[PDB]
Design a protein around this ligand. Structure first.
Ligand SMILES: Nc1nc2c(ncn2[C@@H]2O[C@H](COP(=O)(O)OP(=O)(O)OP(=O)(O)O)[C@@H](O)[C@H]2O)c(=O)[nH]1
Ligand SMILES: Nc1nc2c(ncn2[C@@H]2O[C@H](COP(=O)(O)OP(=O)(O)OP(=O)(O)O)[C@@H](O)[C@H]2O)c(=O)[nH]1
Ligand SMILES: [Mg+2]
Ligand SMILES: [Mg+2]
Lengths: 299, 675, 430, 86, 437
């Protein structure tokens, strides 16, 4: 192809989600048509860049409406996940809203989600990613919280503690949402205020989970995988002088998990990945002095 | 990609731009191009001639796959004209030492490389009015004259591994004989003759999967060796060598083994014209017997195939000549060939596998396609009128069978023999109508293999009285098949065609007669009888012969009833019985004495030997009684239907004979006797 | 031979694969967690044929989810039973194969087959004695066809003596609207006849006609197609998942249902026909089930058994019933409808009974036939293939990826010779 | 005869490995494995599938045993920088 | 004193051998563990029952059987059954891969890997015997393993123990109990392979047993459990001479001399009578003349043939119960004067009478009743050849179309073997027809 030709059809299909959400007779056909139309650009997702901004505005206005039922908001979350897997989350979530006012609403949505609802997992996944986008704000969570002692007795939970609890609860699920949590770990525990109040705690919990997990049970393996992914994200998107004071302790727990003898190929990869990020924490980045004199950027 | 990066970032690769513009993301996609085209272009420079050939000779030629070995051999052949000295001085001796290695694949690859190098050197020397011995020194001539001999010394030709050595030796002999070598009058030629003869005398010992190949590889090698060494003078041959070969091959066409027969048949169709001059009638009489079917050669279907293939092959070698029965195709031998070719058409063999005859009926269709055409390019007068009409009728008949594959070949042959205008055919029944029905422009886009795009067009040939019978026979044998799509498309075309003749009486008085002649032509054949009854039943159920039902005792039904009596009488299979009971209950509609005779026949069949046949006949009688009207009078139909629905046709015979007699008495029909 | 490895390529193959696993888990009592909770010892007598024992008495699947893109891989992992599989059994890429057989058989597939043959040898290593293979893919899609046929060839080249069985899903213009699906289908056949040993024909046109005309559906969806494909899979493999003497292993089933090397295409059938959210309280008798299972309407392929001759027939009756009545009904069906059965392979109709009926049905019946009428499923493909190949349409997609017209010629010739052999064997001794 | 000679060579290789205490012991043992592989790959044009599978399994087991023996007799030292080699 | 060595290979072969051993010990009083209270001599063995049982210095009476299976299924049942303490772990051989109904896969592939193991067990067991008579092999033509591994073992024994008899008890295929369409090919193959390696083999038409179970025993769906209980009784009645103090067929050579005149014609016809159900046990007692007249009825015959059409070459009868020689002689004379029994012109026309005063025995809870007297008539009749005739009808219709032939070609087996076996069967049929003149 060369450009997007199915513009009116896609627009009509996106403007039809408000009359095909109750009964599933016209809900499955719409999803099938959308998937068939989007799969044609699986190899050329760059040809969708100029259409993925207006499609996200139409999809966001439906989920942001308070009068949008659960079945209607979940339908808009499936299309968003489809667009993400088609184009790419790195290039799609970057355009999502990132203002300050979008910090409290989004989080609230994440609180009204049932992890035991496989019929709407796409809602629990994409949502998490959107949260990770609202941690790129240059303010603190204490300023947004304001006064927490507004109610008698029962105090209000800060946004930082809520995000930490949500991340700790979803890094140990089997579904695709654990992965999303790893995105929040690289956007929440790497913040300036969150690191100062959620780095010792998050690193003591991860070590405990690594120490009391087996690679011979289904759950323990999931918890170990989630912890390894979180540690890798922390060591990658984190600083070297904030993460270096912990790289010896982590290396030890990793070596103790006797992974090079497991028959779990994905655990070994995560262990190797975590072994190279910890190692690069012990040495300062250097710059190729040999550039600007051996070839251009392109050919 | 690595080469492109190195050429773009360093620019130190010799001929980087050239090897980068020719070999790219698109041109490199094809492996054949990379191994034959791009290879020569890249080796054209002196910086890639030695290493490329070295790698091809010390790796690719010794691969573990025959396809890769053949590709490397072809690459070396193509790269043998950019480096004759290196191919005749460092690579050729390099291969002579590897041809004797213990490894089988290595020996095969080395033999192929040597043959290719010899062929390339011969082709290069031919373009300079010089012999091939100049490049191939005495050393090369010796080793090449020791490949076949040494192999036989180690009984290396035995076994599956020996089959590949046999094929390699055959290819080498073919290449050496095509390159014109100075091996005339040496024991090497006798040894080669022996090996070719053994390969064909033992084809039944060759894997069926890799058989047809080893036989088309031994006949080809025989055609080059007998055209470069069996030649005493221009246009002649050694009398002694011509008397031993033909006598040996014509005495092997009557072997008891079928594979040997086929091998000798193709070994007799590759003989040069200088070696058939003086004894062509003998070979002709030999293959004629090889393509015939005797009481003992009923299952020899593959023999006739290769016989017909060889027969036409010798007609195209010797050409046509006036006054020369022993040397070429004159008018004294043109009639016998046509008779032998049209004797194989009526060849349907339903052996354990199925219509093995389709293979013999296919080959014949080709032999004529190469005969009538050949004469059309020289002596078109020999193409008789009756013989050509019979050929055109047989082709039209074969172009309507139930086998899509063979029905696509017949249509292609017909189109190749009808459109032919270079020059066109002298006698083609209705050549103007055929041209109008088959526009040359809208012919290349017709999928004859698909029934949908084949039946609607072939059915239009019924309008020609000449091909009417032969097309109706094909449509009949194709309608009574078993495939759903085929029968559906045949019935649709038949109904869309009979609409224009149903109203016309004379049209329904010519087609009906033709169909009844096909019933008298094919009665008790068991190939056309079964499908012809089903077609008649379908035509009667559709309601086509309605204008004749008004007349009483019409000759058509009068003879159809006698034919059905002669056919259905004395049977066993249930399909024929059911098909016969259907035709009878459909023909009952015709009034007159024919109605009474059909009712009597139905009452007789009612008490068949099998209870299932009895129940089927009872049901069909009840159906044809409740459907038609005026078939039973005197208000006796109520009692008839009651005694038919009450009588249990699944009981014994002594209990149902009384009910049959009562029904006959109630219908006014004589009661058959019991002896 | 007591462990079978499961594989699934393409979106449809993975979906058909995930449905069959869920069905056999619900029938065996294995909840999504992995613990046994059924109510019959027979469910555990043959549980090691598809599952593996793990600490805590858990039953881990033995499947391998394979794809070239991540959509279907995330859809199955998040399904109701998604947690059951192994996190390192999901092997996929990012770009797909774009409905091109070449892209899925020579580029992305040729690159991911390395990792695919890593998990495959991981499952074969945890098998006392491998018995065979059971792949689930489609012949229409590019990735599902190309890379999946590339995995059959690699397994046949690696494992010398191992049975190969597949569940090919033939596409249909009524379901999809893609033009290059005839080419993606023909080539696949050219591989199966020369690679796979057993192959079930599940035509999409037959499913569409059964869902639109029989079940009464205005817009049959892919959810209805997977509801008919999973039931057929559960019915045809009921002998390998429970005790039995007829076809307990794959080698016996092949020897009994494969009279010739090239001829091994079996059209399956299941009765009574049902749909999602439908409970039939009426329990059909044994004669009614035997008469309905042989009906062309209950066939998963677009071929009429009456317009052909049978070669090998295998029937299974699941439900509490009597064996004498079933045997008498089978004998009566063989005697009455005797013209539809070749008389040159004596005892070519087998019948089996099981005491574990499917879920939601008290009486079920199955049919795995080897009639020559299946040739009709290929003739249709032939017409489309020839019509699209003679004018050269969308051919640059293949020739530009290493392929050439020689492969299409070869596949067309192989398929055409398979039709002629079927027609000849149908008229043996005519 | 092919199966007989294959079993004989396998038993010989096993006996040689069971008593391997030199690099020459293991190096000669790793040249009988090459010969066996070359023989088998040149005989798959007339052998059955079960025999080929058995030969492949035997070759894999022998290669694993040879690798274990090489790792045991020759324990590769851990990685260490070349700083202050002398 | 001499002792035999029995062998049971395959699913049908081992399942019948288990019931036979159960019935043998059931009659000898040998407890399930192996202790025989009736035996007063410990360590010494020289009685009639020692032909099929050895004795340890504790008392245990071990059988002389060789249970070999190519898959762990039937062997596990006997290993964790009731008589697992009766046999030793070494005598219970087991393999892995199954032949899956294929003579080639069992004779040139999965059978040439475990033959040596079975042969080493057949040598260790024989070393503990001062005298050996022969080998009683139990197999089946339907199972490919019973056609391949059994034939290989017989061929190897013909070379090893080249001076010992090899009596056989094959099982003939039937459609009501069958699970393979390739049972005629393997049957013809094993028949052609064993024709030149056996002395006397008794056939067991599964159709006859099914009919006897559905009519006499009054069973709606006879199962392999009921068939094994009815065939074990006949197997024991036939081998009753080799386990009791009798006077007929005491040795294996006696069988060949009294029932196998022509070396190639060694397929006698066996019959057993009476066969009354357990419900009709205490009803009526049939005399010797009552069970001798029913023996000739095709309903009781083991093979579905018509001996009345053909003639006989040899005949013998073995009784069990309170049978008097005078009554048996009178019944035989009456049957000869009534029925028109014809014998071959060059063959001796006499009946070998052999009475056994021991009463019959049946397993508790079985469908067979404890009859007061039973008889097993073995007569070599040419009508049995008809049983092979129909079998050839299943070999020409399929082999003509080259059906299921690739399974043997791809397993190392040649194609000419089928033609050779068919020619051998045709020659055997021609010899049978010539003997009828
Ligand atoms: N029955 C059924 N057919 C399906 C399903 N999904 C796809 N198909 C059919 O499969 C064909 C398309 O192949 P896909 O499975 O989408 O192909 P793939 O394996 O994903 O390959 P690429 O699309 O090239 O990446 C068409 O004929 C569809 O109708 C499904 O769930 N059920
Ligand atoms: N009478 C009787 N027949 C049996 C028995 N078991 C199997 N059969 C019959 O034997 C034939 C098949 O032989 P099996 O014993 O099952 O086969 P096998 O010898 O184990 O062979 P493979 O499994 O192929 O290696 C069929 O005709 C069965 O009906 C049994 O216990 N008794
Ligand atoms: Mg896809
Ligand atoms: Mg068995």
């Amino acid at each position: 192809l060369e450009a997007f030709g199915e513009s009116a059809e896609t627009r009509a299909l996106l403007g039809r989600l408000r009359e095909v959400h109750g009964g599933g007779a016209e809900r499955e056909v719409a999803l099938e048509r959308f998937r068939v139309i989007m799969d044609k650009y699986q190899e050329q997702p760059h040809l969708l860049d100029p259409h993925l901004e207006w499609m996200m505005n139409l999809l966001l206005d439906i989920v942001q409406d308070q009068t949008s039922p659960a079945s209607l908001v979940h339908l808009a979350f499936k299309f968003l996940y489809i667009i993400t897997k088609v184009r790419g989350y790195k290039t799609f979530l970057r355009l999502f809203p990132h203002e300050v006012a979008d910090v409290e609403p989004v989080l609230d949505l994440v609180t009204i989600q049932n992890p035991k609802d496989h019929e709407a997992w796409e809602t629990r996944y994409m949502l998490l990613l959107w949260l990770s986008v609202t941690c790129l704000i240059p303010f603190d969570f204490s300023r947004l919280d304001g006064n927490l002692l507004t109610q008698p007795g029962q105090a209000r939970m800060s946004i930082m503690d809520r995000i930490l609890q949500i991340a700790e609860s979803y890094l140990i699920v089997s579904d695709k949402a654990r992965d999303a949590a790893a995105v929040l770990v690289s956007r929440f525990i790497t913040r300036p205020d969150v690191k100062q109040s959620k780095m010792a705690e998050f690193l003591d919990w991860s070590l405990c989970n690594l120490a009391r997990s087996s690679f011979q049970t289904m759950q323990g393996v999931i918890t170990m995988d989630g912890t390894l992914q979180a540690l890798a994200q922390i060591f990658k998107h984190g600083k070297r002088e904030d993460c270096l004071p912990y790289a010896a302790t982590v290396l030890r727990c990793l070596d103790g998990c006797r992974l090079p003898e497991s028959n779990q190929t994905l655990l070994r990869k995560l262990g190797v990945k975590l072994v190279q990020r910890l190692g690069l924490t012990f040495l300062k980045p250097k710059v190729a002095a040999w550039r600007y004199q051996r070839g251009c950027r392109s050919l | 990609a690595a080469f492109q990066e190195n050429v773009g970032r360093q620019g130190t690769f010799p001929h980087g731009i050239d090897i980068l513009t020719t070999a790219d993301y698109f041109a490199v996609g094809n492996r054949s191009n990379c191994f034959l085209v791009i290879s020569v272009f890249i080796a054209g420079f002196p910086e890639y001639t030695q290493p490329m050939i070295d790698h091809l000779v010390t790796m690719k030629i010794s691969h573990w796959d025959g396809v890769i070995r053949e590709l490397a051999a072809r690459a070396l052949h193509n790269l043998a004209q950019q480096a004759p000295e290196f191919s005749a001085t460092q690579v050729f001796p390099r291969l002579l030492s590897m041809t004797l290695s213990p490894d089988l694949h290595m020996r095969h690859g080395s033999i192929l490389a040597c043959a290719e190098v010899a062929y390339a050197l011969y082709k290069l020397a031919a373009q300079e009015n010089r012999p091939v011995t100049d490049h191939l020194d005495e050393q090369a001539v010796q080793g090449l004259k020791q490949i076949h001999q040494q192999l036989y010394d180690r009984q290396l030709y035995r076994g599956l591994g020996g089959q590949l050595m046999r094929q390699a030796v055959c290819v080498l002999i073919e290449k050496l004989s095509l390159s014109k070598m100075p091996f005339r009058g040496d024991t090497v030629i006798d040894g080669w003759q022996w090996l070719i003869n053994d390969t064909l005398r033992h084809l039944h010992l060759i894997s069926s999967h890799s058989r047809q190949q080893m036989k088309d590889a031994a006949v080809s090698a025989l055609a080059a060796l007998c055209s470069e060494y069996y030649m005493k003078e221009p246009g002649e041959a050694d009398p002694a060598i011509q008397e031993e070969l033909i006598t040996q091959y014509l005495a092997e066409l009557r072997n008891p083994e079928e594979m040997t027969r086929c091998g000798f048949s193709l070994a007799l169709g590759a003989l040069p014209g200088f070696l058939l001059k003086g004894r062509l009638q003998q070979v002709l009489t030999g293959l004629r017997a090889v393509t015939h079917t005797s009481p003992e050669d009923v299952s020899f279907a593959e023999s006739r195939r290769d016989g017909l293939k060889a027969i036409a092959r010798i007609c195209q070698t010797v050409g046509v000549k006036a006054g020369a029965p022993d040397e070429a195709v004159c008018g004294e031998n043109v009639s016998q060939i046509y008779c032998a070719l049209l004797g194989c058409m009526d060849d349907y063999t339903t052996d354990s596998r199925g219509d093995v005859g389709t293979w013999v009926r296919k080959a014949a269709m080709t032999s004529l396609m190469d005969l009538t055409l050949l004469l059309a390019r020289s002596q078109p007068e020999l193409i008789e009128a009756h013989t050509c009409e019979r050929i055109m009728c047989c082709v039209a008949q074969q172009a309507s069978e139930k086998i899509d594959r063979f029905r696509a070949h017949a249509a292609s042959v017909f189109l190749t023999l009808l459109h032919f205008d270079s020059p066109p055919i002298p006698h083609v029944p209705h050549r103007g109508e055929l041209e109008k029905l088959f526009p040359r422009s809208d012919v290349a886009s017709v999928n004859w293999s698909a029934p949908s795009q084949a039946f609607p067009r072939i059915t239009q040939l019924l309008g020609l009285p000449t091909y009417r019978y032969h097309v109706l026979l094909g449509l009949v044998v194709s309608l009574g098949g078993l495939t759903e799509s085929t029968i559906r498309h045949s019935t649709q075309s038949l109904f869309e065609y009979m609409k224009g003749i149903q109203s016309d009486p004379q049209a329904l008085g010519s087609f009906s007669g033709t169909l009844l002649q096909i019933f008298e032509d094919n009665l008790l054949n068991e190939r056309v009888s079964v499908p012809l009854l089903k077609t008649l039943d379908h035509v009667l159920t559709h309601g086509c012969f309605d204008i004749f039902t008004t007349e009483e005792d019409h000759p058509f039904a009068v003879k159809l009833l006698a034919l059905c009596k002669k056919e259905i009488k004395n049977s066993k299979d249930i399909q024929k019985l059911l098909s016969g009971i259907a035709v009878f209950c459909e023909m009952v509609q015709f009034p007159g004495d024919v109605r009474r005779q059909a009712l009597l026949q139905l009452c007789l069949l009612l008490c068949h030997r099998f209870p299932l046949i009895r129940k089927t006949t009872a049901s069909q009688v009840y159906e044809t009684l409740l459907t038609y009207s005026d078939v039973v009078g005197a208000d006796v139909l109520d009692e008839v239907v009651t005694v038919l629905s009450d009588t249990a046709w699944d009981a014994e015979l002594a209990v149902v004979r009384e009910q049959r007699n009562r029904l006959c008495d109630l219908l006014g029909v004589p009661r058959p006797q019991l002896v | 031979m007591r462990e079978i490895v499961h594989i699934q390529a393409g979106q449809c193959g993975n979906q058909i694969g995930a449905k069959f696993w869920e069905v056999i888990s619900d029938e065996h009592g294995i909840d999504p967690t992995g613990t046994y909770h059924g109510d019959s010892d027979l469910q555990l007598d043959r549980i090691s044929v598809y599952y593996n024992e793990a600490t805590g008495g858990k039953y881990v699947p033995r499947a391998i989810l394979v794809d070239l893109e991540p959509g279907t891989m995330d859809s199955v992992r998040s399904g109701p039973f998604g947690q059951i599989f192994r996190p390192d059994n999901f092997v996929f890429g990012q770009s797909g194969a774009g409905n091109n057989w070449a892209k899925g058989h020579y580029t992305e597939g040729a690159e991911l087959v390395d990792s695919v043959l890593d998990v495959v040898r991981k499952e074969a290593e945890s098998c006392d004695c491998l018995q065979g293979f059971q792949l689930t893919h489609s012949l229409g899609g590019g990735t599902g066809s190309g890379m999946g046929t590339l995995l059959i060839s690699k397994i046949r080249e690696e494992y010398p003596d191992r049975i190969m069985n597949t569940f090919s899903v033939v596409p249909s213009p009524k379901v999809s609207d893609t033009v290059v699906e005839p080419y993606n289908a023909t080539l696949s056949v050219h591989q199966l006849v020369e690679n796979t040993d057993e192959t079930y024909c599940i035509d999409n046109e037959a499913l569409y006609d059964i869902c639109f005309r029989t079940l009464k559906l205005t817009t049959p969806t892919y959810g209805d197609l997977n509801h008919l494909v999973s039931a057929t899979m559960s019915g045809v493999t009921t002998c390998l998942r429970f005790p039995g003497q007829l076809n307990a292993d794959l080698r016996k089933l092949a020897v009994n249902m494969v009279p010739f090397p090239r001829l091994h295409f079996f059209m399956p059938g299941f009765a009574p026909l049902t749909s999602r959210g439908s409970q039939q309280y009426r329990a059909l008798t044994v004669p009614e089930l035997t008469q309905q299972v042989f009906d062309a309407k209950n066939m998963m392929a677009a071929c009429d058994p009456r317009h052909g001759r049978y070669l090998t027939v295998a029937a299974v009756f699941r439900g509490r019933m009597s064996m004498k009545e079933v045997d008498e009904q089978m004998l009566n069906v063989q005697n009455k409808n005797s013209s539809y059965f070749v008389e040159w392979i004596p005892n070519n109709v087998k019948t089996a009974v099981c005491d574990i009926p499917p879920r939601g049905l008290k009486m079920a019946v199955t049919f795995i036939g080897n009639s020559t009428a299946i040739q009709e499923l290929f003739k249709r493909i032939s017409e489309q293939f020839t019509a699209m190949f003679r004018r050269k349409a969308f051919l640059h997609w293949y020739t530009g990826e290493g392929m050439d017209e020689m492969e299409f010629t070869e596949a067309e010739s192989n398929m055409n010779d398979l039709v002629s052999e079927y027609q000849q064997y149908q008229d043996a001794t005519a | 005869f092919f199966v007989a000679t294959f079993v004989r060579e396998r038993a010989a290789v096993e006996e040689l490995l069971e008593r391997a205490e030199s690099v020459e012991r293991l190096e000669e043992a790793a040249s009988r494995l090459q010969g066996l592989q070359k023989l088998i790959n040149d005989s798959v044009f007339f052998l059955a599938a079960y025999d080929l599978r058995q030969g492949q399994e035997a070759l894999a087991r022998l290669q694993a045993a040879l690798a274990e023996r090489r790792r045991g007799l020759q324990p590769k030292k851990r990685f260490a920088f070349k700083t202050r080699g002398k | 004193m001499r002792e035999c060595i029995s062998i049971h290979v395959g699913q049908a072969g081992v399942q019948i051998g288990n019931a036979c051993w159960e019935l043998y010990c059931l009659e000898h009083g040998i407890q399930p563990d192996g202790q025989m209270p009736s035996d007063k001599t410990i360590g010494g063995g020289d009685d009639s029952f020692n032909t099929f049982f050895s004795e340890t210095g504790a008392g245990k009476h071990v059988p002389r059987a060789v249970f070999v299976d190519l898959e762990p299924t039937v062997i596990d049942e006997v290993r964790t059954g009731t008589y697992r303490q009766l046999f030793h772990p070494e005598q219970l051989i087991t393999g892995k891969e199954d032949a899956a109904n294929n003579y080639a896969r069992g004779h040139y592939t999965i059978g040439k890997e475990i033959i040596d193991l079975v042969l080493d067990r057949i040598r260790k067991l024989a070393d503990q015997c001062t005298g050996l008579q022969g080998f009683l092999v139990f197999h089946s033509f339907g199972g490919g393993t019973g056609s391949g591994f059994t034939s290989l073992l017989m061929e190897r024994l013909s070379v090893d123990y080249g001076k010992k008899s090899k009596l056989e008890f094959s099982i003939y295929p039937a459609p009501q109990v069958s699970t393979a369409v390739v049972e005629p090919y393997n049957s013809i193959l094993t028949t052609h392979t064993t024709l030149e390696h056996s002395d006397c083999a008794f056939m067991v038409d599964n159709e006859a047993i099914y009919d006897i179970c559905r009519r006499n025993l009054d069973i709606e769906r006879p199962t392999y459990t009921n068939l094994n209980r009815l065939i074990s009784q006949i197997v024991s009645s036939i081998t009753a001479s080799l386990r009791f103090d009798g006077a007929l067929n005491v040795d294996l050579t006696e069988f060949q001399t009294n029932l196998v005149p022509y070396p190639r014609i060694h397929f006698p016809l066996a019959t057993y009578a009476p066969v009354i159900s357990a419900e009709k046990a205490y009803h009526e007692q049939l005399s010797v003349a009552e069970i001798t007249n029913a023996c000739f009825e095709p309903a009781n015959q083991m093979v579905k043939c018509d001996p009345r059409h053909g003639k006989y070459m040899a005949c013998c009868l073995l009784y069990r119960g309170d049978v008097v020689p005078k009554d048996v002689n009178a019944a035989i004379a009456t049957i000869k004067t009534k029925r028109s029994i014809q014998f071959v012109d060059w063959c001796p026309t006499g009946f070998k009478v052999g009475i056994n005063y021991q009463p019959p025995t049946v397993v508790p809870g079985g469908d067979l009743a404890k009859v007061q007297r039973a008889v097993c008539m073995l007569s070599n009749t040419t009508a049995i050849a008809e049983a092979w005739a129909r079998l050839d009808h299943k070999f020409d219709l399929m082999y003509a179309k080259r059906a299921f032939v690739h399974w043997y070609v791809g397993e190392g087996m040649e194609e000419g073997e089928f033609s050779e076996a068919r020619e051998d069967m045709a020659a055997l049929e021609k010899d049978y027809e010539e003997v009828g003149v």
